[PDB]
Design a protein around this ligand. Structure first.
Ligand SMILES: Cc1cc2nc3c(=O)[nH]c(=O)nc-3n(C[C@H](O)[C@H](O)[C@H](O)COP(=O)(O)OP(=O)(O)OC[C@H]3O[C@@H](n4cnc5c(N)ncnc54)[C@H](O)[C@@H]3O)c2cc1C
Ligand SMILES: Cc1cc2nc3c(=O)[nH]c(=O)nc-3n(C[C@H](O)[C@H](O)[C@H](O)COP(=O)(O)OP(=O)(O)OC[C@H]3O[C@@H](n4cnc5c(N)ncnc54)[C@H](O)[C@@H]3O)c2cc1C
Lengths: 530, 557
């Protein structure tokens, strides 16, 4: 059990914990996955749902960064392919091998047909891939147009193909939390930290239950802040400090596969003389692409896509594919996110052109803060967190904290061997936990057999409190299967209403929430009503 | 024989019947062209204003550098091209460019460096791979600070973090030109030194020959030829301007560079060393061992003035001494410690730099072009690409001889045509030197000298060994005498400096022993040519001037 039941118990049990963690993203989720495995009594709190922050709004990939070889920044490339190795090892059901395609042009560079080849050999050598079935290779201008029919011809010299990975971020967070649960940790989502319990120090926190206006006080030896782009907002809860962050907005658009077919990931130049590059990626029967870099000020819980972000991106896909003719009217889904950057770094520092871009400082009040960084280095940042924690529990309290190896502790649903039609999907999506799903496959009105269990499983096991957490973060219904959402939408909500036995007004408020969300995704407010 | 006598017969033939190809300039670029034309059957002539190599081909860095710096901006094709042609040159002249691994120390207090301990490793591995060197006896390796000071205890310690060691070659530029020249002569080419082109001959607006002046006798002759190719290095514009019937746009813009020599006890470096100037100007300086000395440079300044005898300025010297005194803090080197030196002009095409050499169509930085009047010009390039430059030129030459006159020519593989003294298995230099040295010992020479001469002359050591067997000149050792006699009869020595400066390492690298042999060498050449007493006194005054300039006597006041 891991639902609203397990939830209420947790809240009560936290009524002096060893460690309190603020933030339920990939960062907070990684700290706990390790602390629990090491003994510490831990109690984490996530203001909204799990992973509903930036950790569900990224490019959704694990790019190697081959681009860095242009300035011979070889140590950065080695770290990256190296850490990417661990993760794939501790979560064999999430990041998957999805070789990428990099076309070469003499009209417009970065590499030529001769240099891409040597760049890809140094890449596989550092990645220790050199030899396996995923070894790089090149393509002739003829054999490139085959795979991608609408790809610009004027000036095509061919292309290169090297290893890269697909990675659902939301699932990475949840299966880390679900493993943190199994190890006894008070994980409470939908609970917001609103104040601090103080002489001059910090001994506790005062949280609010967003499900019930009840205010509780928490007691713990140490309080660590891992609120991502919210790092400063959480800090300022202590009424004198200065800013440490400066986030940027990036967005993505989505279209039907037949409006822009691409059998594999494709990286290329914008063509607007700004040095930026763009992706066009496949994902089920769709193809999404992007992204975007712009200073942002306003609401952090729901950043919005505008006309100018659309203009910019359309001008890019239309130049790289002159035969597509894509307009605002072709987009079926979308999303926006904010990058947790420290004053000084930029968005291009993610792929070229304590951890790289992150820090772990301790405030004078005694608050630990882990900021910046990037999802691909989540496990690595937490190991550096558990260090200033296993030492801080002794030099001040004398607790015998254990020692582990995060690089080898496999998480939820993925404990099998690394080199491991709707039961096929279920296996390759939940991995191991697909076993528990089958046992449950007593359907529901308007739904299907399989779709019933994946919903029941969410409620029983994935802390599904609201319907949106299911169609958005626990599965790919809203973002990649829009054209199938309207014949499962109402049914799903009623099974939720049933399981929770909400009420005729709690049910009304919920549905109201799905309306606002789906609409902002489908940019109805821009289309002057679709 | 290849001497003043051969010279005089060549001068008559070039006047008897028309040539198919006449070459202007006897440095590495013309020597290169001459060898490939001769081997192909093309009747060939070549004229050189001074001695062979007296221009910029005897004034370079005397190294064959790989260009590992180019990996910093991932310019891999340039590096592949360079290590690849270096292997090709070693195959045709295994007795000149030799292996001599480079030491590259790493520092953290310098601010903005090229590589760090982590990055030099992946750079040296990529370097060896591109050069098919990984898996051989010269594959790279790194050193720790304490390992570095073990080899050079006098290197700046503040910040030293270790070193990288990778493969590179030492190269004698003057000996490389003359062994290409000797090969061309053996294959029939008419080669004349101390002969200057002073004008063109015409039939309409079309060049059909050259008027040449014999600098030794004030005589002026006419040479008829089907094609004329200009390979005069930094003098490329000045030669093109011998056509006064048409002013023309300049292609060149030469820069100057110098090199200084001190005795090794003053800067003991066991192997070549490469480092930052410390003047944050983006440049690098070398410290290299040669015989029992250490030489260092170089500089890079815009120039105007006489092209035949460029001079070292006090400003060139202070720039270099500031670099060495910063890199080795206890050595304290000043002008008084310098015993020899040289300066030359880079043949750059308007728009290029000395920097592009080491990462500071035909080949990088060169061009092959024909003028409206029929004159062909081959300009730019660098010494390490000489054979590749001659190949592109021969390609156009055969195509013009067939089309315009119906003349078929044999196609040779220049990548395998070994030059003078280099006819032996390139992978077995030491075995070949061990054997030849025996033939030398059985001739009356000592162990040290026979090995030297075999390593320096290669196969040609046998002729040196034969003459040795047969008559020491007054004041000279059996060994020295045999080298000089070989010089006069087989290497076209015509004046004292040709021998002490370019055929041997006497002036530059053994200055401390030059006085013992200076006069005996002039006397032997004097009697051998049978000079008037007035002629000898002038050949003497001229050599003294060359020594005064190397010694930096004026600056020293
Ligand atoms: C456009 C874009 C592209 C990206 N591309 C890459 C990439 O290519 N490679 C890469 O490695 N990374 C990439 N990233 C970055 C990566 O997604 C983030 O670094 C990562 O998701 C940050 O995780 P986090 O847990 O620190 O922050 P979040 O995921 O935002 O989690 C922090 C949580 O704190 C919670 N919180 C805030 N205040 C409170 C409070 N008062 N009480 C309780 N909880 C609170 C919030 O609800 C939030 O869920 C990209 C990001 C963006 C925006
Ligand atoms: C300081 C310095 C550093 C350098 N660094 C490098 C390096 O690291 N790597 C590299 O590969 N290269 C390097 N170079 C360049 C290399 O030395 C030259 O490219 C090469 O020697 C030039 O060949 P060249 O034969 O074209 O000219 P040259 O040797 O100059 O010869 C041209 C010849 O034609 C003759 N001539 C002129 N006019 C007439 C006439 N009217 N009649 C008859 N003959 C005439 C001249 O007397 C001369 O002998 C460097 C040069 C310098 C000076």
């Amino acid at each position: 059990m891991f639902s609203n039941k397990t939830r209420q118990d947790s809240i009560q049990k936290m009524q002096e914990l060893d460690l309190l963690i603020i933030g339920g993203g990939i960062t907070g989720a990684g700290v706990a996955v390790q602390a629990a495995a090491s003994g510490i009594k831990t109690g984490l709190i996530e203001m909204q749902d799990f992973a509903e922050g930036t950790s569900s709004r990224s490019t959704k990939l694990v790019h190697g960064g081959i681009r860095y070889l242009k300035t011979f920044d070889v140590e950065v490339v080695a770290d990256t392919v190296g850490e990417r190795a661990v993760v794939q090892g501790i979560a064999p059901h999430i990041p998957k091998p999805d070789p990428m395609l990099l076309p070469i042009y003499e009209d417009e560079t970065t590499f030529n047909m001769f240099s891409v080849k040597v760049a890809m050999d140094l890449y596989d050598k550092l990645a220790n891939v050199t030899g396996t079935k995923y070894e790089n290779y090149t393509l002739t201008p003829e054999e490139v147009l085959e795979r991608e029919p609408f790809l610009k011809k004027e000036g095509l010299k061919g292309a290169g193909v090297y290893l890269d990975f697909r990675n659902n971020d939301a699932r990475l967070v949840i299966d880390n939390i679900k493993k943190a649960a199994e190890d006894g940790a008070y994980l409470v989502s939908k609970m917001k930290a609103v104040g601090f319990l103080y002489g001059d120090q910090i001994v506790g926190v005062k949280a609010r239950d967003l499900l019930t206006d009840e205010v509780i006080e928490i007691k713990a030896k140490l309080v660590i802040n891992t609120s991502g782009p919210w790092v400063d907002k959480v800090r300022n809860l202590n009424f004198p400090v200065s800013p440490k962050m400066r986030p940027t907005k990036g967005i993505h658009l989505v279209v039907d596969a037949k409006k822009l077919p691409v059998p594999q990931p494709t990286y290329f130049d914008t063509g607007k003389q700004d040095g930026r590059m763009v992706f066009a990626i496949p994902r089920e029967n769709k193809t999404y692409f992007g992204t975007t870099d712009t200073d942002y000020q306003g609401d952090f819980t729901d950043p919005k896509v505008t006309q100018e972000d659309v203009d910019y991106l359309l001008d890019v896909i239309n130049h790289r594919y002159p035969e597509a003719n894509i307009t605002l009217a072709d987009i079926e889904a979308s999303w926006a996110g904010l990058r947790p950057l420290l004053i000084g770094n930029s968005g291009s520092d993610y792929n070229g052109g304590i951890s790289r871009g992150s820090s772990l400082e301790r405030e004078p009040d005694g608050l630990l803060t882990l900021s910046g960084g990037k999802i691909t280095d989540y496990r690595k940042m937490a190991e550096g967190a558990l260090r200033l924690i296993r030492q801080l529990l002794k030099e001040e309290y004398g607790i015998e904290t254990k020692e582990i190896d995060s690089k080898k502790y496999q998480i939820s649903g993925g404990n099998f061997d690394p080199t491991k039609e709707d039961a096929t999907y279920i296996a390759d999506f939940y991995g191991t936990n697909a076993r528990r799903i089958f046992e449950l496959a007593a359907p529901y009105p308007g739904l299907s057999l399989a779709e019933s269990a994946r919903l029941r499983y969410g409620l029983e096991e994935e802390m599904v409190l609201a319907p949106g957490d299911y169609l958005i973060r626990r599965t790919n219904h809203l973002l990649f299967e829009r054209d199938q959402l309207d014949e499962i939408k109402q049914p799903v909500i009623d099974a939720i209403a049933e399981y929770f036995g909400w009420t005729e007004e709690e049910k009304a408020q919920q549905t109201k929430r799905l309306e606002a969300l789906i609409a902002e995704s489908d940019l109805r407010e821009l289309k002057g009503e679709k």
